[PDB]
């Protein structure tokens, strides 16, 4: 449908709940007959600057080929969850599959 690139930033004390969040989000996409192309946890990572009075965050990259209606449902899940701090969804021209330069 519409290729999106989703990266979100988890509160680092909620790093344990991260694979529980990813499986729900994949089941949101694949349950809505969307594709998921790569899915790359980046772990805890030192922030460039302290967002929200704290210095580290847990990064997750996720590439998604879903219809635009369920992504807008997915964005509200990032908005009201307090575990995720920042979320960025970026529309992509195609489906990307190659590993990240920092997964390397």
């Amino acid at each position: 449908m519409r290729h999106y690139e989703i990266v979100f930033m988890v509160h680092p004390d909620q790093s344990e709940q991260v694979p529980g969040m990813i499986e729900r989000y994949t089941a949101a996409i694949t349950g809505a007959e969307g594709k998921i192309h790569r899915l790359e946890d980046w772990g805890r990572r030192q922030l460039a600057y302290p967002i929200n009075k704290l210095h580290k965050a847990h990064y997750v990259l996720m590439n998604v080929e879903a219809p635009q209606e369920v992504i807008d449902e997915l964005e509200t899940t990032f908005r009201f969850n307090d575990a995720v701090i920042r979320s960025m969804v970026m529309r992509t021209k195609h489906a990307v599959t190659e590993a990240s330069p920092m997964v390397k």
Partner: peptide
């Protein structure tokens, strides 16, 4: 400007 938004790059060297 996208990497600054995801705290991958600083906006300046001073802010903290």
């Amino acid at each position: 400007k996208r990497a600054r938004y995801l705290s991958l790059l600083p906006y300046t060297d001073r802010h903290q």
